[model samples]
Target: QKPFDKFFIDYIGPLPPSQGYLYVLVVVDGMTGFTWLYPTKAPSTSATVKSLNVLTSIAIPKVIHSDQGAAFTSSTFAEWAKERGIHLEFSVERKNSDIKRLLTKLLVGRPTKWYDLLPVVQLALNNTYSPVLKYTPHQLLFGSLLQEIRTSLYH
Candidate 1:
Protein backbone atom coordinates (compact mmCIF):
# COMPACT_ATOMS: atom_id res chain seq x y z
CA GLN A 1 0.00 0.00 0.00
CA LYS A 2 2.88 2.39 -0.58
CA PRO A 3 1.35 3.77 -3.79
CA PHE A 4 0.67 7.45 -3.38
CA ASP A 5 3.07 7.93 -0.52
CA LYS A 6 6.00 6.69 -2.53
CA PHE A 7 6.42 7.62 -6.18
CA PHE A 8 8.56 6.68 -9.16
CA ILE A 9 9.20 9.65 -11.42
CA ASP A 10 10.46 9.93 -14.98
CA TYR A 11 9.83 11.50 -18.36
CA ILE A 12 9.48 10.26 -21.96
CA GLY A 13 9.81 12.67 -24.81
CA PRO A 14 11.75 14.80 -27.24
CA LEU A 15 9.63 13.35 -29.98
CA PRO A 16 8.09 15.44 -32.78
CA PRO A 17 6.95 18.08 -30.26
CA SER A 18 3.33 17.56 -30.90
CA GLN A 19 1.23 20.55 -29.84
CA GLY A 20 4.35 22.36 -28.69
CA TYR A 21 5.24 19.76 -26.09
CA LEU A 22 8.50 17.87 -26.30
CA TYR A 23 8.32 15.62 -23.28
CA VAL A 24 5.98 13.91 -20.86
CA LEU A 25 6.71 13.65 -17.17
CA VAL A 26 5.34 10.48 -15.65
CA VAL A 27 4.69 9.89 -11.98
CA VAL A 28 3.65 6.49 -10.60
CA ASP A 29 2.57 5.60 -7.12
CA GLY A 30 4.66 2.64 -6.04
CA MET A 31 2.03 1.11 -3.81
CA THR A 32 -1.36 1.91 -5.35
CA GLY A 33 -0.17 1.80 -8.98
CA PHE A 34 -1.86 5.12 -9.78
CA THR A 35 -0.23 7.33 -12.36
CA TRP A 36 -0.07 11.01 -13.40
CA LEU A 37 1.20 12.45 -16.65
CA TYR A 38 2.26 15.98 -17.57
CA PRO A 39 3.26 17.36 -20.94
CA THR A 40 6.08 19.86 -21.13
CA LYS A 41 8.03 21.76 -23.75
CA ALA A 42 11.26 20.63 -22.19
CA PRO A 43 12.56 18.07 -19.72
CA SER A 44 14.26 20.77 -17.71
CA THR A 45 14.36 20.75 -13.94
CA SER A 46 12.00 23.73 -13.77
CA ALA A 47 9.33 21.92 -15.76
CA THR A 48 9.69 18.75 -13.72
CA VAL A 49 9.55 20.71 -10.49
CA LYS A 50 6.44 22.58 -11.63
CA SER A 51 4.58 19.35 -12.33
CA LEU A 52 5.88 17.73 -9.13
CA ASN A 53 4.83 20.72 -7.13
CA VAL A 54 1.27 20.57 -8.42
CA LEU A 55 0.91 16.87 -7.63
CA THR A 56 2.65 17.14 -4.27
CA SER A 57 0.15 19.75 -3.17
CA ILE A 58 -2.58 17.16 -3.62
CA ALA A 59 -0.62 14.51 -1.71
CA ILE A 60 2.84 15.17 -0.48
CA PRO A 61 4.95 12.07 -0.97
CA LYS A 62 7.05 10.58 1.79
CA VAL A 63 9.67 9.57 -0.70
CA ILE A 64 10.09 10.29 -4.39
CA HIS A 65 12.25 7.93 -6.39
CA SER A 66 13.74 8.64 -9.78
CA ASP A 67 16.73 8.03 -11.98
CA GLN A 68 19.79 10.25 -11.78
CA GLY A 69 18.57 12.54 -14.49
CA ALA A 70 19.51 16.18 -14.27
CA ALA A 71 15.88 17.12 -13.75
CA PHE A 72 15.63 14.90 -10.69
CA THR A 73 19.15 15.36 -9.40
CA SER A 74 19.31 19.12 -9.64
CA SER A 75 19.98 21.01 -6.42
CA THR A 76 16.85 23.13 -6.78
CA PHE A 77 14.53 20.13 -6.93
CA ALA A 78 16.50 18.36 -4.21
CA GLU A 79 16.27 21.35 -1.94
CA TRP A 80 12.57 21.82 -2.64
CA ALA A 81 11.84 18.24 -1.67
CA LYS A 82 14.04 18.42 1.38
CA GLU A 83 12.26 21.54 2.56
CA ARG A 84 9.00 19.66 2.38
CA GLY A 85 10.50 16.92 4.57
CA ILE A 86 10.46 14.59 1.60
CA HIS A 87 13.18 12.03 0.95
CA LEU A 88 14.64 11.69 -2.52
CA GLU A 89 15.76 8.29 -3.73
CA PHE A 90 17.55 7.25 -6.88
CA SER A 91 17.20 4.13 -8.98
CA VAL A 92 18.08 2.93 -12.43
CA GLU A 93 15.77 3.71 -15.33
CA ARG A 94 13.13 0.96 -15.67
CA LYS A 95 9.59 1.80 -14.55
CA ASN A 96 9.29 4.63 -17.06
CA SER A 97 10.15 2.26 -19.89
CA ASP A 98 6.79 0.58 -19.39
CA ILE A 99 5.07 3.95 -19.67
CA LYS A 100 6.92 4.58 -22.88
CA ARG A 101 6.09 1.11 -24.21
CA LEU A 102 2.38 1.50 -23.60
CA LEU A 103 2.41 5.06 -24.96
CA THR A 104 4.05 3.76 -28.12
CA LYS A 105 1.19 1.31 -28.50
CA LEU A 106 -1.33 4.09 -28.04
CA LEU A 107 0.33 6.35 -30.59
CA VAL A 108 0.37 3.64 -33.29
CA GLY A 109 -0.59 5.48 -36.46
CA ARG A 110 -0.52 9.07 -35.25
CA PRO A 111 2.99 9.33 -33.88
CA THR A 112 2.75 13.11 -33.89
CA LYS A 113 -0.12 13.06 -31.45
CA TRP A 114 1.82 11.84 -28.44
CA TYR A 115 1.03 15.00 -26.53
CA ASP A 116 -2.65 14.71 -27.34
CA LEU A 117 -2.61 11.09 -26.15
CA LEU A 118 -1.02 11.72 -22.76
CA PRO A 119 -4.24 11.88 -20.79
CA VAL A 120 -5.70 8.90 -22.61
CA VAL A 121 -2.58 6.89 -21.97
CA GLN A 122 -2.66 7.80 -18.30
CA LEU A 123 -6.27 6.75 -18.00
CA ALA A 124 -5.66 3.43 -19.77
CA LEU A 125 -2.69 2.62 -17.55
CA ASN A 126 -4.44 3.45 -14.34
CA ASN A 127 -7.64 1.70 -15.32
CA THR A 128 -5.99 -1.45 -16.61
CA TYR A 129 -5.26 -4.41 -14.32
CA SER A 130 -1.93 -4.65 -12.62
CA PRO A 131 -0.29 -7.99 -11.81
CA VAL A 132 1.16 -6.72 -8.52
CA LEU A 133 -2.19 -5.57 -7.19
CA LYS A 134 -4.43 -8.21 -8.78
CA TYR A 135 -6.69 -5.23 -9.60
CA THR A 136 -6.68 -2.07 -11.59
CA PRO A 137 -4.76 0.86 -10.13
CA HIS A 138 -7.91 2.96 -10.15
CA GLN A 139 -9.74 0.22 -8.27
CA LEU A 140 -7.13 0.10 -5.54
CA LEU A 141 -6.59 3.80 -5.45
CA PHE A 142 -10.21 4.83 -5.64
CA GLY A 143 -12.01 1.70 -4.34
CA SER A 144 -13.69 0.96 -7.68
CA LEU A 145 -12.88 0.24 -11.30
CA LEU A 146 -13.61 2.58 -14.13
CA GLN A 147 -15.95 1.70 -16.98
CA GLU A 148 -13.70 0.61 -19.83
CA ILE A 149 -14.60 1.01 -23.48
CA ARG A 150 -13.37 -1.69 -25.80
CA THR A 151 -13.13 -1.17 -29.54
CA SER A 152 -11.62 -2.87 -32.55
CA LEU A 153 -11.36 0.10 -34.87
CA TYR A 154 -8.84 2.91 -34.82
CA HIS A 155 -10.17 6.44 -35.06
Candidate 2:
Protein backbone atom coordinates (compact mmCIF):
# COMPACT_ATOMS: atom_id res chain seq x y z
CA GLN A 1 0.00 0.00 0.00
CA LYS A 2 2.89 2.35 -0.69
CA PRO A 3 0.49 4.62 -2.51
CA PHE A 4 -2.28 2.43 -3.92
CA ASP A 5 -0.48 -0.78 -4.83
CA LYS A 6 -1.40 -4.18 -3.38
CA PHE A 7 0.74 -7.28 -2.76
CA PHE A 8 -0.70 -10.73 -2.00
CA ILE A 9 1.01 -13.67 -0.26
CA ASP A 10 -0.53 -17.01 0.66
CA TYR A 11 -0.61 -17.65 4.41
CA ILE A 12 -0.48 -21.42 4.63
CA GLY A 13 0.23 -21.88 8.28
CA PRO A 14 2.17 -20.40 11.17
CA LEU A 15 5.82 -21.32 11.38
CA PRO A 16 6.72 -24.39 13.42
CA PRO A 17 9.38 -24.35 16.11
CA SER A 18 10.75 -27.63 14.81
CA GLN A 19 11.15 -28.56 11.16
CA GLY A 20 7.64 -29.27 9.98
CA TYR A 21 5.49 -27.57 7.36
CA LEU A 22 2.92 -24.78 7.19
CA TYR A 23 1.07 -22.69 4.64
CA VAL A 24 0.19 -19.01 4.24
CA LEU A 25 0.03 -16.13 1.80
CA VAL A 26 0.14 -12.34 1.99
CA VAL A 27 -1.38 -9.79 -0.39
CA VAL A 28 -0.39 -6.13 0.03
CA ASP A 29 -2.03 -3.24 -1.73
CA GLY A 30 0.80 -1.19 -3.20
CA MET A 31 -0.92 2.12 -2.60
CA THR A 32 -2.04 1.38 0.93
CA GLY A 33 0.14 -1.63 1.70
CA PHE A 34 -2.99 -3.50 2.73
CA THR A 35 -2.03 -7.18 2.61
CA TRP A 36 -4.50 -10.07 2.46
CA LEU A 37 -3.41 -13.34 4.00
CA TYR A 38 -4.47 -16.86 2.93
CA PRO A 39 -3.66 -20.15 4.62
CA THR A 40 -3.48 -23.36 2.65
CA LYS A 41 -1.90 -26.82 2.40
CA ALA A 42 0.29 -27.22 -0.62
CA PRO A 43 0.58 -24.03 -2.65
CA SER A 44 0.11 -25.01 -6.24
CA THR A 45 -1.26 -23.00 -9.12
CA SER A 46 -4.66 -24.41 -8.18
CA ALA A 47 -4.47 -23.06 -4.65
CA THR A 48 -3.29 -19.69 -5.85
CA VAL A 49 -6.15 -19.56 -8.33
CA LYS A 50 -8.60 -20.39 -5.58
CA SER A 51 -7.18 -17.61 -3.44
CA LEU A 52 -7.65 -15.24 -6.34
CA ASN A 53 -11.29 -16.17 -6.42
CA VAL A 54 -11.57 -15.28 -2.75
CA LEU A 55 -9.80 -11.99 -3.40
CA THR A 56 -12.36 -11.05 -6.05
CA SER A 57 -15.01 -11.19 -3.41
CA ILE A 58 -13.29 -8.16 -1.86
CA ALA A 59 -11.59 -6.49 -4.83
CA ILE A 60 -10.62 -7.30 -8.37
CA PRO A 61 -6.94 -7.30 -9.24
CA LYS A 62 -5.94 -5.83 -12.58
CA VAL A 63 -2.74 -7.86 -12.73
CA ILE A 64 -1.18 -10.77 -10.84
CA HIS A 65 2.56 -10.95 -10.33
CA SER A 66 4.17 -14.21 -9.29
CA ASP A 67 7.31 -16.29 -9.35
CA GLN A 68 7.66 -18.39 -12.49
CA GLY A 69 6.73 -21.59 -10.76
CA ALA A 70 5.27 -24.42 -12.81
CA ALA A 71 1.81 -23.83 -11.34
CA PHE A 72 1.87 -20.17 -12.20
CA THR A 73 3.03 -20.85 -15.76
CA SER A 74 0.60 -23.67 -16.37
CA SER A 75 -1.91 -23.44 -19.17
CA THR A 76 -4.77 -23.75 -16.76
CA PHE A 77 -3.63 -20.69 -14.85
CA ALA A 78 -3.26 -18.76 -18.06
CA GLU A 79 -6.77 -19.65 -19.11
CA TRP A 80 -8.08 -18.77 -15.69
CA ALA A 81 -6.59 -15.29 -15.91
CA LYS A 82 -7.77 -14.81 -19.47
CA GLU A 83 -11.31 -15.70 -18.54
CA ARG A 84 -11.27 -13.04 -15.84
CA GLY A 85 -9.57 -10.32 -17.88
CA ILE A 86 -6.64 -10.24 -15.45
CA HIS A 87 -3.08 -10.15 -16.66
CA LEU A 88 -0.39 -12.35 -15.07
CA GLU A 89 3.26 -11.52 -14.71
CA PHE A 90 6.10 -13.82 -13.59
CA SER A 91 9.48 -12.79 -12.27
CA VAL A 92 12.74 -14.05 -13.66
CA GLU A 93 14.24 -16.77 -11.49
CA ARG A 94 17.53 -14.97 -11.09
CA LYS A 95 15.99 -11.63 -10.21
CA ASN A 96 13.96 -13.29 -7.45
CA SER A 97 17.07 -12.87 -5.32
CA ASP A 98 16.26 -9.20 -4.91
CA ILE A 99 13.11 -9.85 -2.92
CA LYS A 100 14.91 -12.28 -0.63
CA ARG A 101 17.57 -9.68 -0.04
CA LEU A 102 14.97 -7.08 0.75
CA LEU A 103 13.35 -9.34 3.30
CA THR A 104 16.65 -10.14 5.01
CA LYS A 105 17.72 -6.51 5.27
CA LEU A 106 14.31 -5.33 6.38
CA LEU A 107 14.15 -7.92 9.14
CA VAL A 108 17.34 -6.34 10.53
CA GLY A 109 19.69 -8.20 12.89
CA ARG A 110 17.00 -10.23 14.57
CA PRO A 111 17.13 -13.96 13.85
CA THR A 112 13.82 -13.97 11.97
CA LYS A 113 11.83 -17.06 12.61
CA TRP A 114 9.23 -16.15 9.99
CA TYR A 115 6.79 -18.88 10.96
CA ASP A 116 6.41 -17.45 14.44
CA LEU A 117 6.69 -13.76 13.67
CA LEU A 118 4.75 -13.23 10.44
CA PRO A 119 1.51 -12.09 12.01
CA VAL A 120 3.25 -9.80 14.46
CA VAL A 121 5.54 -8.44 11.78
CA GLN A 122 2.63 -7.76 9.52
CA LEU A 123 0.79 -5.92 12.24
CA ALA A 124 3.85 -3.88 13.05
CA LEU A 125 4.29 -2.96 9.40
CA ASN A 126 0.70 -1.81 9.16
CA ASN A 127 0.84 0.15 12.38
CA THR A 128 3.71 2.42 11.45
CA TYR A 129 3.00 5.59 9.47
CA SER A 130 5.17 5.89 6.42
CA PRO A 131 7.16 9.11 6.50
CA VAL A 132 6.31 10.09 2.96
CA LEU A 133 2.80 8.66 2.94
CA LYS A 134 2.05 10.07 6.39
CA TYR A 135 -0.52 7.36 7.14
CA THR A 136 -0.54 3.86 8.53
CA PRO A 137 -1.49 0.98 6.27
CA HIS A 138 -4.68 0.47 8.24
CA GLN A 139 -5.69 4.08 7.69
CA LEU A 140 -4.93 3.97 3.99
CA LEU A 141 -6.43 0.61 3.09
CA PHE A 142 -9.91 0.69 4.56
CA GLY A 143 -10.03 4.07 6.26
CA SER A 144 -10.01 2.07 9.51
CA LEU A 145 -8.06 -0.54 11.43
CA LEU A 146 -8.76 -4.25 10.97
CA GLN A 147 -9.35 -6.87 13.58
CA GLU A 148 -7.65 -10.11 12.63
CA ILE A 149 -10.15 -12.48 11.05
CA ARG A 150 -9.09 -15.89 12.24
CA THR A 151 -9.80 -18.80 9.92
CA SER A 152 -9.69 -22.49 10.75
CA LEU A 153 -7.05 -24.33 8.77
CA TYR A 154 -7.03 -28.03 7.96
CA HIS A 155 -3.67 -29.80 7.41
Candidate 3:
Protein backbone atom coordinates (compact mmCIF):
# COMPACT_ATOMS: atom_id res chain seq x y z
CA GLN A 1 0.00 0.00 0.00
CA LYS A 2 1.17 3.54 -0.64
CA PRO A 3 2.11 5.84 2.23
CA PHE A 4 -1.32 7.45 2.42
CA ASP A 5 -3.30 5.09 0.26
CA LYS A 6 -5.80 4.76 3.10
CA PHE A 7 -6.36 7.29 5.82
CA PHE A 8 -7.82 6.57 9.24
CA ILE A 9 -9.43 9.74 10.56
CA ASP A 10 -11.00 10.75 13.86
CA TYR A 11 -12.33 13.95 15.33
CA ILE A 12 -11.09 14.73 18.82
CA GLY A 13 -12.88 17.41 20.69
CA PRO A 14 -15.71 19.30 22.41
CA LEU A 15 -13.36 19.70 25.30
CA PRO A 16 -12.20 22.94 26.93
CA PRO A 17 -11.92 25.15 23.88
CA SER A 18 -8.48 26.29 22.81
CA GLN A 19 -7.71 28.98 20.26
CA GLY A 20 -11.46 29.32 19.88
CA TYR A 21 -11.58 25.85 18.41
CA LEU A 22 -13.34 22.92 20.01
CA TYR A 23 -12.69 20.16 17.49
CA VAL A 24 -9.52 18.63 16.17
CA LEU A 25 -9.57 16.48 13.07
CA VAL A 26 -7.04 13.72 13.60
CA VAL A 27 -5.82 11.97 10.47
CA VAL A 28 -3.71 8.82 10.53
CA ASP A 29 -1.99 7.51 7.45
CA GLY A 30 -2.78 3.81 7.07
CA MET A 31 0.51 2.60 5.62
CA THR A 32 2.99 4.89 7.33
CA GLY A 33 1.12 5.48 10.60
CA PHE A 34 1.97 9.15 10.10
CA THR A 35 -0.47 11.66 11.57
CA TRP A 36 -1.71 15.20 11.03
CA LEU A 37 -3.77 17.18 13.53
CA TYR A 38 -6.07 19.91 12.31
CA PRO A 39 -8.14 22.05 14.68
CA THR A 40 -11.59 23.27 13.77
CA LYS A 41 -14.58 24.76 15.58
CA ALA A 42 -17.04 22.00 14.74
CA PRO A 43 -17.03 18.42 13.54
CA SER A 44 -19.34 19.30 10.69
CA THR A 45 -18.97 18.46 7.06
CA SER A 46 -17.85 21.97 6.21
CA ALA A 47 -15.05 21.87 8.74
CA THR A 48 -13.93 18.49 7.49
CA VAL A 49 -14.01 19.72 3.92
CA LYS A 50 -11.83 22.77 4.61
CA SER A 51 -9.35 20.89 6.74
CA LEU A 52 -9.19 18.15 4.12
CA ASN A 53 -8.64 20.76 1.46
CA VAL A 54 -5.51 21.94 3.24
CA LEU A 55 -4.42 18.35 3.92
CA THR A 56 -5.10 17.02 0.42
CA SER A 57 -3.16 19.94 -1.00
CA ILE A 58 -0.06 17.81 -0.57
CA ALA A 59 -1.34 14.22 -0.89
CA ILE A 60 -4.68 12.64 -1.55
CA PRO A 61 -5.72 9.35 -0.05
CA LYS A 62 -7.48 6.65 -2.03
CA VAL A 63 -9.67 5.62 0.89
CA ILE A 64 -10.68 7.16 4.20
CA HIS A 65 -11.66 5.00 7.18
CA SER A 66 -13.37 6.70 10.07
CA ASP A 67 -15.96 6.16 12.75
CA GLN A 68 -19.52 6.85 11.68
CA GLY A 69 -19.38 10.35 13.03
CA ALA A 70 -22.05 12.84 11.99
CA ALA A 71 -19.57 14.91 10.01
CA PHE A 72 -18.62 11.98 7.84
CA THR A 73 -22.12 10.56 7.50
CA SER A 74 -23.43 13.59 5.66
CA SER A 75 -24.13 13.67 1.95
CA THR A 76 -21.94 16.71 1.55
CA PHE A 77 -18.95 14.87 2.89
CA ALA A 78 -19.77 11.87 0.74
CA GLU A 79 -20.00 14.07 -2.32
CA TRP A 80 -16.73 15.77 -1.46
CA ALA A 81 -14.92 12.49 -1.17
CA LYS A 82 -16.62 11.19 -4.29
CA GLU A 83 -15.37 14.18 -6.26
CA ARG A 84 -11.81 13.26 -5.32
CA GLY A 85 -12.29 9.60 -6.22
CA ILE A 86 -11.76 8.66 -2.62
CA HIS A 87 -13.67 5.81 -1.03
CA LEU A 88 -15.05 6.28 2.48
CA GLU A 89 -15.33 3.55 5.07
CA PHE A 90 -16.93 3.70 8.47
CA SER A 91 -16.37 1.31 11.33
CA VAL A 92 -18.52 0.72 14.36
CA GLU A 93 -15.45 -0.45 16.25
CA ARG A 94 -13.21 1.44 18.67
CA LYS A 95 -10.30 3.79 18.13
CA ASN A 96 -6.52 3.58 18.23
CA SER A 97 -5.44 3.01 21.81
CA ASP A 98 -2.04 4.58 21.21
CA ILE A 99 -3.63 7.85 20.22
CA LYS A 100 -6.13 7.74 23.07
CA ARG A 101 -3.49 7.36 25.75
CA LEU A 102 -0.99 9.59 24.04
CA LEU A 103 -3.43 12.47 24.05
CA THR A 104 -4.33 11.81 27.67
CA LYS A 105 -0.67 11.88 28.65
CA LEU A 106 0.01 15.01 26.63
CA LEU A 107 -3.19 16.77 27.66
CA VAL A 108 -3.03 16.00 31.37
CA GLY A 109 -1.20 19.15 32.32
CA ARG A 110 -3.37 22.21 31.78
CA PRO A 111 -5.27 20.88 28.78
CA THR A 112 -6.34 24.42 28.03
CA LYS A 113 -3.07 25.04 26.27
CA TRP A 114 -3.76 22.23 23.82
CA TYR A 115 -3.57 24.58 20.88
CA ASP A 116 0.03 25.57 21.57
CA LEU A 117 0.93 21.99 22.43
CA LEU A 118 -0.55 20.49 19.25
CA PRO A 119 2.47 20.75 16.97
CA VAL A 120 4.67 18.94 19.46
CA VAL A 121 1.99 16.34 19.98
CA GLN A 122 1.77 15.76 16.25
CA LEU A 123 5.53 15.33 15.97
CA ALA A 124 5.79 13.18 19.06
CA LEU A 125 3.00 10.91 17.93
CA ASN A 126 4.41 10.51 14.44
CA ASN A 127 7.93 9.97 15.76
CA THR A 128 6.88 7.31 18.25
CA TYR A 129 8.44 3.89 17.70
CA SER A 130 6.00 1.11 17.01
CA PRO A 131 7.44 -2.38 17.32
CA VAL A 132 4.82 -3.67 14.89
CA LEU A 133 6.58 -1.74 12.14
CA LYS A 134 10.09 -1.86 13.67
CA TYR A 135 10.51 1.77 12.65
CA THR A 136 9.03 5.09 13.57
CA PRO A 137 6.41 6.52 11.24
CA HIS A 138 8.57 9.56 10.69
CA GLN A 139 11.43 7.39 9.54
CA LEU A 140 9.24 5.40 7.22
CA LEU A 141 7.29 8.30 5.74
CA PHE A 142 9.97 10.98 5.70
CA GLY A 143 13.01 8.71 5.47
CA SER A 144 14.80 10.37 8.42
CA LEU A 145 15.70 9.64 12.01
CA LEU A 146 14.61 11.76 14.99
CA GLN A 147 17.15 10.90 17.67
CA GLU A 148 18.48 14.46 17.70
CA ILE A 149 15.10 16.13 17.98
CA ARG A 150 14.20 13.87 20.87
CA THR A 151 17.14 15.22 22.90
CA SER A 152 17.61 18.74 21.57
CA LEU A 153 16.26 20.36 24.71
CA TYR A 154 17.98 20.86 28.17
CA HIS A 155 21.01 22.35 26.50
Identify the leading candidate in terms of lDDT: 3
Please give the lDDT score for candidate 1: 0.75
TM for every model, in the order presented, reads 0.84, 0.59, 0.84
Candidate 3 lDDT tens digits, 65-143: 9889999999999999999999999981122555455555556556777777777767876776665558877898987
Which parts of model 1 are misplaced by more than 4 Å? 92-95, 144-155
Off by over 4 Å in 2: 1-21, 92-124, 144-155
- Range of the 10 consecutive residues with the lowest summed lDDT in candidate 3: 145-154
Tens digit per residue, CA lDDT, model 2, 1-155 = 23333343432333332123244555666556655555445557777778778877676677677766666788998998898777777672211222233234434433335445455545655665554667776887767112221110000
How many steric overlaps are in each model, in order?
2, 34, 0
Collision count of model 3:
0
* Residue 101, candidate 2: C-alpha displacement in angstroms: 11
| Model 3 Cα shift for residue 86 (angstroms) | 0.7
List the candidates ranked by lDDT, beginning with the highest. Answer: 3, 1, 2
Q: For candidate 3, give the lDDT.
A: 0.76
lDDT of each: 0.75, 0.53, 0.76
RMSD in Å for all candidates: 4.5, 9.0, 5.0
CA lDDT of 113 in candidate 1? 84
